[PDB]
Amino acid sequence: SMQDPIADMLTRIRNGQAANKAAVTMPSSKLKVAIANVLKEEGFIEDFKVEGDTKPELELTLKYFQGKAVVESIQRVSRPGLRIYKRKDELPKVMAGLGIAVVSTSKGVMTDRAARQAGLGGEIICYVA
Amino acid sequence: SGLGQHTTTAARLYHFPHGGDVIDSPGVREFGLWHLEPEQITQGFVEFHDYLGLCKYRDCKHDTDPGCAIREAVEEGKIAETRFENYHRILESMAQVKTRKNFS
Amino acid sequence: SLSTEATAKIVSEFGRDANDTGSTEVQVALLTAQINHLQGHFAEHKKDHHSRRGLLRMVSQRRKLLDYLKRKDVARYTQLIERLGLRR
Amino acid sequence: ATVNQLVRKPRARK
RNA sequence: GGCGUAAAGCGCACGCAGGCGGUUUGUUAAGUCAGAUGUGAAAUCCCCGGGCUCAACCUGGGAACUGCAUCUGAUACUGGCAAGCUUGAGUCUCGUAGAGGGGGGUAGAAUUCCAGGUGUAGCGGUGAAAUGCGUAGAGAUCUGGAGGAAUACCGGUGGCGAAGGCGGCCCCCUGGACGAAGACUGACGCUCAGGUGCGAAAGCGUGGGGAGCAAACAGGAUUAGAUACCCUGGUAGUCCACGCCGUAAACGAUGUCGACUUGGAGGUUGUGCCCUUGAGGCGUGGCUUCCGGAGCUAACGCGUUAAGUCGACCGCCUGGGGA
RNA sequence: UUAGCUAGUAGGUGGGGUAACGGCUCACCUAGGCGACGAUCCCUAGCUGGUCUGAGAGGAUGACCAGCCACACUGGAACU
Ligand SMILES: Nc1nc2c(ncn2[C@@H]2O[C@H](COP(=O)(O)OP(=O)(O)NP(=O)(O)O)[C@@H](O)[C@H]2O)c(=O)[nH]1
Ligand SMILES: [Mg+2]
Ligand SMILES: [Mg+2]
Ligand SMILES: [Mg+2]
Ligand SMILES: [Mg+2]
Ligand SMILES: [Mg+2]
Ligand SMILES: [Mg+2]
Ligand SMILES: [Mg+2]
Ligand SMILES: [Mg+2]
Ligand SMILES: [Mg+2]
Ligand SMILES: [Mg+2]
Ligand SMILES: [Mg+2]
Ligand SMILES: [Mg+2]
Ligand SMILES: [Mg+2]
Ligand SMILES: [Mg+2]
Ligand SMILES: [Mg+2]
Ligand SMILES: [Mg+2]
Ligand SMILES: [Mg+2]
Ligand SMILES: [Mg+2]
Ligand SMILES: [Mg+2]
Ligand SMILES: [Mg+2]
Ligand SMILES: [Mg+2]
Ligand SMILES: [Zn+2]
Numbered sequence: 201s202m203q204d205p206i207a208d209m210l211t212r213i214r215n216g217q218a219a220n221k222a223a224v225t226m227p228s229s230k231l232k233v234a235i236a237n238v239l240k241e242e243g244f245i246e247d248f249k250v251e252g253d254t255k256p257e258l259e260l261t262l263k264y265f266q267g268k269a270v271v272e273s274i275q276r277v278s279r280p281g282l283r284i285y286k287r288k289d290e291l292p293k294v295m296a297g298l299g300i301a302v303v304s305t306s307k308g309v310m311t312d313r314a315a316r317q318a319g320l321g322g323e324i325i326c327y328v329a
Numbered sequence: 330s331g332l333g334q335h336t337t338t339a340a341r342l343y344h345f346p347h348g349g350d351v352i353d354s355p356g357v358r359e360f361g362l363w364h365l366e367p368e369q370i371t372q373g374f375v376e377f378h379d380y381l382g383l384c385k386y387r388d389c390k391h392d393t394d395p396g397c398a399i400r401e402a403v404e405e406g407k408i409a410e411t412r413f414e415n416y417h418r419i420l421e422s423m424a425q426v427k428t429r430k431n432f433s
Numbered sequence: 434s435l436s437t438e439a440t441a442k443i444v445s446e447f448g449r450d451a452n453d454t455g456s457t458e459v460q461v462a463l464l465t466a467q468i469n470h471l472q473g474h475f476a477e478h479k480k481d482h483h484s485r486r487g488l489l490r491m492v493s494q495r496r497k498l499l500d501y502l503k504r505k506d507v508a509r510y511t512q513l514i515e516r517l518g519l520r521r
Numbered sequence: 522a523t524v525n526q527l528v529r530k531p532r533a534r535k
Numbered sequence: 536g537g538c539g540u541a542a543a544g545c546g547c548a549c550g551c552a553g554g555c556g557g558u559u560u561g562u563u564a565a566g567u568c569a570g571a572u573g574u575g576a577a578a579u580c581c582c583c584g585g586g587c588u589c590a591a592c593c594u595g596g597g598a599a600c601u602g603c604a605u606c607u608g609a610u611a612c613u614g615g616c617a618a619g620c621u622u623g624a625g626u627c628u629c630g631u632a633g634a635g636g637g638g639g640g641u642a643g644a645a646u647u648c649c650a651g652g653u654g655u656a657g658c659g660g661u662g663a664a665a666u667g668c669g670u671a672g673a674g675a676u677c678u679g680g681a682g683g684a685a686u687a688c689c690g691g692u693g694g695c696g697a698a699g700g701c702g703g704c705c706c707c708c709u710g711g712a713c714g715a716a717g718a719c720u721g722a723c724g725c726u727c728a729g730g731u732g733c734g735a736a737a738g739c740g741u742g743g744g745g746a747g748c749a750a751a752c753a754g755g756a757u758u759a760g761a762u763a764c765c766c767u768g769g770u771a772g773u774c775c776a777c778g779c780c781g782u783a784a785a786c787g788a789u790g791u792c793g794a795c796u797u798g799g800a801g802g803u804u805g806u807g808c809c810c811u812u813g814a815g816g817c818g819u820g821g822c823u824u825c826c827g828g829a830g831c832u833a834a835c836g837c838g839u840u841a842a843g844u845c846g847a848c849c850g851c852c853u854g855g856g857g858a
Numbered sequence: 859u860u861a862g863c864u865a866g867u868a869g870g871u872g873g874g875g876u877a878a879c880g881g882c883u884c885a886c887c888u889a890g891g892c893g894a895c896g897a898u899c900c901c902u903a904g905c906u907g908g909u910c911u912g913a914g915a916g917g918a919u920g921a922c923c924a925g926c927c928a929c930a931c932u933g934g935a936a937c938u
Contacts, residue, residue, distance in 0.1 A: 201623070201725055201793040203556045207846045208794050214844065215796045219829075226795090227622070229558065234611075255622055256558080280555060281847070282524050283613070285567050290601095305568070306609045321568050323612050332762065358759050422759090440627075448719095455626045455719030463626075474637095474708065482733055483636035486697080487710040489549060489732080496550090498625090501723045522537075525554060525848070529728075534917095535853075 207276045217269045228256035234309045244271055275327040287321045299329040363431050392417045434467050457498050458513055464495040465517045
């Protein structure tokens, strides 16, 4: 059903980005905040707010160029049907280093560019292309 | 139940004890009359040769034409009416086989 | 399922008050009395294969609800199985 | 298509 | 890599094992990751060299051997334990719609049989005829009775059901679906190989039943022949009980569930408010058809009910024919 | 188009046994063991370090070199 909520999060981002929507809403969680705040610090989105404490509702502000999609495509890599893990030197790049790869480690959620100074590996979340 | 079967194939050759050859035939239910004009249908019957040139007109369908001397010979009894009713059945079969077209 | 007098009483039998109606042990008893209500029906009506689908739904629904109380707290499980006559 | 289907039986090479 | 039509989504449903799983916190460090030790024989391959006049070839050291075992770490995610939370999935009440199934009665046309009455030369059938029926009075009409099976109109891309399917009315028993207001349990869930049940019609077994229709067959036309077509009849079967058989172009030729993404023309079914100022105005869920944008597609077309973008799981296909 | 297999079989006591533990062997005691994570049956095959192919992942195989196991006309047995 909603068994991969991160893949449900990537579905709601990719649709409203392409369909010229100004802002989207989604059910919040701890892990969804730990991904959207990284995308806010990497220039892909604008802002996020939390609403509700018994039903946590996350909101995302979209971002455009001249009415053109900033996030052109995003790819869920690991999934509950097949888990993907890499080491500190087998971290894949997106568009040969242009896009970022969201990898959550013990030192929080960071990119593979940020995992060079950290020297860790773990679960690949999404290819932000 | 009331029919016949064609088991033996087209033609197998053998010899008579005296002389000559034999040719067997298939069980055939077909009638190919695409060859020639219905003038040749008039020539296809033996006793109808000697009664030609006796009717009224120089051309005659011999069924719907008044004064057919061939029809007078059938009414006389020198020609049986089984052959005459089958004669125009051949001509009316050319009204139904000819319909689509066929040529060699 | 049943009338109002049969429904509301069994909720008061196994519930702590009149509001204790959504709990799992009540839901077992709602299906237990319903299958016991349909014992003589399907014996006479073996050619009613369409109402048998509703019967096999409630047997499968009761089995799933017995699996929840058994995996969490077996003390309330051992009470209800003999109090309604289960485990055969 | 499913990876979990190939756990039971792999792709049958002709 | 695909499964609407190119080969392919089991006919459908239940459900064990298996896979997978919302959200908050703590704990374990299981999976994973970081570091280190030991090990992964040599030769081969790779890096830089050296040597045989050169190359092949031989060879120095390093790298590689992505492996496995152990220790010390980090705790975001996955797993286990613990306590939870409510939007998922369920429970109650008040209601509404429906050919949902089973059982038992009952109605009236029509068909045919039989009884009676009045009544006369054809009825019947086809492109045209014949077989067949009828002066024992057919056919037609009217009265009365018997049996059998089906339900005109309503009735419509209308409704219901997992599907095949389901249609006179009435009673009884019984199933799911949907809506409103809240209360309540607290992930109780999704999915499914074997297993399990349902599953059009034909046909099979035993015992009933018999109008109409109707394989085989009888008979007459057609014809080259008629075996088929057409027509007059007619058994099995169609009907019911009791089983078995389990295949269909069982088709939406689309497996199920969930999350989102511009919209219209309508239908069906509710509910909330409103000069009730009319069966209306304004909203808002469930179900359903036809158009159509972006997007997808081999084309056709699909297009908020996807064949758009994705996840969870399962089935199935690998040139045609053989098959 | 292999679903049940297995009575020295699974475990225990004691005796015996080899260089060493042990159903390795024997009496007794228990009725378990294995198995849809493929037991068992049938067919095929020495395996590995590697070679070859391939961008890689994979794919096919095991001659020469090296490591190990088995075998020495067929079958069985013990001595040294
Ligand atoms: N009583 C009888 N039977 C006969 C006579 N002649 C032939 N038959 C039978 O008729 C049948 C047909 O004979 P056949 O010669 O096979 O016929 P056909 O015409 O050759 N057949 P096809 O068309 O296959 O070649 C046979 O069974 C044969 O015995 C006869 O004079 N009397
Ligand atoms: Mg009801
Ligand atoms: Mg292809
Ligand atoms: Mg096809
Ligand atoms: Mg189907
Ligand atoms: Mg080596
Ligand atoms: Mg070396
Ligand atoms: Mg070397
Ligand atoms: Mg040189
Ligand atoms: Mg009648
Ligand atoms: Mg509570
Ligand atoms: Mg029979
Ligand atoms: Mg007929
Ligand atoms: Mg029968
Ligand atoms: Mg079939
Ligand atoms: Mg269609
Ligand atoms: Mg368009
Ligand atoms: Mg459309
Ligand atoms: Mg084939
Ligand atoms: Mg011993
Ligand atoms: Mg040698
Ligand atoms: Mg060797
Ligand atoms: Zn003439």
